[PDB]
Design a binder for these strands. Structure first.
Ligand SMILES: [Zn+2]
Ligand SMILES: [Zn+2]
Lengths: 122, 123
DNA sequence: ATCAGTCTAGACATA
DNA sequence: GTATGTCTAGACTGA
C-alpha cells in the first residue's frame, strides 16, 4: 500500500461493518488490558502467525453470546472475522485447534478468542 | 379549533422529546397491561382530575431510575412531565400527596406513577 | 460525593 | 426450533 494512496485512505469513511469492527476490537482490548500480558500475547499471535501462541480469553456469557454496540454474536466467530476470515458466516465454519485450552464449545468459565486457535472449514 | 388545523397537525413531525415521550408511554403501558385494571385506573385519574384516584405503580429499580430508549430519569418525574407539567426539571420540584401509598421517596417495592398523586413546588 | 451517562448481560419476544 | 433481534436493570465510569 502506497504513500499517496495511504494518505487519501486516511480520509476514507468506513462501512457500517468496518466501524462496528472498530468497536468490537475496542471492546476486546478493554477486557484484555486488565489481565497481565494478554495484550502482548494477542499481539504476538496476530503478528507472528506461524509461531504458536497461548490462549487469549474473555469470560463466557451464559448463552455464550457477546454484545458489542447493540449487536450479538459468538466471541470466537466475531474476532475470527476481524483478523482471519472477513466472510466467515457462523460458528459451524469454525472448529478448534488442539492447542487451545478454552475453546467455545468448552462450556468453561472462559472462552478463548485467539483467532489462530481455530481452523476454518466448510 | 378547526378540523383541518388538527389534520395538518397530524402530519407534524415531532422533536426528539416528543418522540421519546411516546416511547416512554409505550413502556409504561406495556408494564401496566400485566396488572389488573391499572390501565382503567390510570385513565380515571387522567380523565377526572377532581375525583381522587388510587395509586398506579411500577416496579422500583435499585437506584430508583427508569430507563426508556437509552434515557434515564425518575419514574414519577418522567410521567409527571408527560401529563401535568411538561417543564418539570427534577424531583426537587415534586412532593407527594398524602393520598399516595407508594411515593417515590418511600423506597417501597412499587412506585406510584399517578401524576395526580404529586404536587409541584418551586425548588 | 448525588448526578448522569454509557455499555451490556440477561430476559424476553418474533421469526 | 434455534436463531436473531429488542429492551433495560445493574454495573460501572466519571462530575
Ligand atoms: Zn486458545
Ligand atoms: Zn400514589
Amino acid at each position: 500500500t502506497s504513500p499517496a494512496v495511504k494518505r487519501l485512505l486516511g480520509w476514507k469513511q468506513g462501512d457500517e461493518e468496518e466501524k462496528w469492527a472498530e468497536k468490537a476490537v475496542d471492546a476486546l482490548v478493554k477486557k484484555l488490558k486488565k489481565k497481565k500480558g494478554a495484550m502482548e500475547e494477542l499481539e504476538k499471535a496476530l503478528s507472528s502467525p506461524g509461531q504458536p501462541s497461548k490462549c487469549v480469553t474473555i469470560p463466557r456469557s451464559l448463552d455464550g453470546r457477546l454484545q458489542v454496540s447493540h449487536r450479538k454474536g459468538l466471541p470466537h466467530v466475531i474476532y475470527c472475522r476481524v483478523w482471519r476470515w472477513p466472510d466467515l458466516q457462523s460458528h459451524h465454519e469454525l472448529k478448534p485447534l488442539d492447542i487451545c485450552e478454552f475453546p467455545f464449545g468448552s462450556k468453561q468459565k472462559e472462552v478463548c478468542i485467539n483467532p489462530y486457535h481455530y481452523k476454518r472449514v466448510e
